[PDB]
Structure formats: structure tokens, C-alpha cells
Write a protein that binds this ligand. Sequence first.
Ligand SMILES: C=CCn1c(-c2cccc(Cl)c2)n[nH]c1=S
Length: 133
Amino acid sequence: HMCDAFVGTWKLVSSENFDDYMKEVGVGFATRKVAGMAKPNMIISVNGDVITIKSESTFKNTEISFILGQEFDEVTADDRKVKSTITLDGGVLVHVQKWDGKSTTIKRKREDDKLVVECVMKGVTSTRVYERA
Ligand SMILES: C=CCn1c(-c2cccc(Cl)c2)n[nH]c1=S
């Protein structure tokens, strides 16, 4: 019953500072342009201890399945090969990605009827807001 409030189908409705976040991560020009246009749907489901987060967009489709606290391999939409660990901290899903000596943290939380995604790379934050589809 952990992540019940996250489960569902969500559509991107707003994004702030995402180009600067992608720059800080190392995403190249063309990917930033095309990725920045996309309006993904995020589909979150839970089956036992396994959480699945799917992103479907015109840019890329991605899918991760994981158990909280248990590291896994992830291929990001920008084609990084990262080692990811996702935990629940005070009701917030906290997703750390490690690659090439770098790290980024993505937090996902419920706020009113929205699902808010905060992506941080060093001093740079981007906020992406999703509503139920
Ligand atoms: C998962 C975190 C942010 N995100 C992305 C994303 C993440 C990394 C690189 C790229 Cl190109 C896109 N697409 N939709 C969201 S929300």
C-alpha cells in the first residue's frame, strides 16, 4: 500500500528549467531539443514489492522495474548507462543515478492532485509537473 498514491497514468503538464538540468547532466544539443519538446505519459504500477515506472513519449520510451533499496541497471532516455537506487523517504520516492563518477537525484512526490518530479544535478534543479491522464 506503500506507493498507492503514485499508481496510475500521468501526463506532463509543465516543465521548468529542464534544459539547464539536461545541460548539467551532459545531454547534447540535439537530444536536449527533442527531449525538451516531449510531453510524456508516466505509468506507475506496483505488483508485490516490485514498482514499475514507464515513460511513453514521442522522444523515447523507457521502463524501469525495481525493489526499494535495491540497486539496478538503468538506460536513461538520453542513453546514459547508470546504476540506480530508489528509496521511499518520508513519502517521497528518491531516485539516485550514478555514472562516470557523476550523480543525479530525481524526487517524485504527490502534491494535491499532481505528481511533481524534481530533478537535481549539482546546483541545478528542474521541476516537472504531471496530472492524472
Ligand atoms: C526521469 C526524470 C526526468 N524526465 C525525463 C528525462 C530524464 C533524463 C533524460 C531525459 Cl532526455 C529525459 N523525461 N521525463 C522526465 S520527468
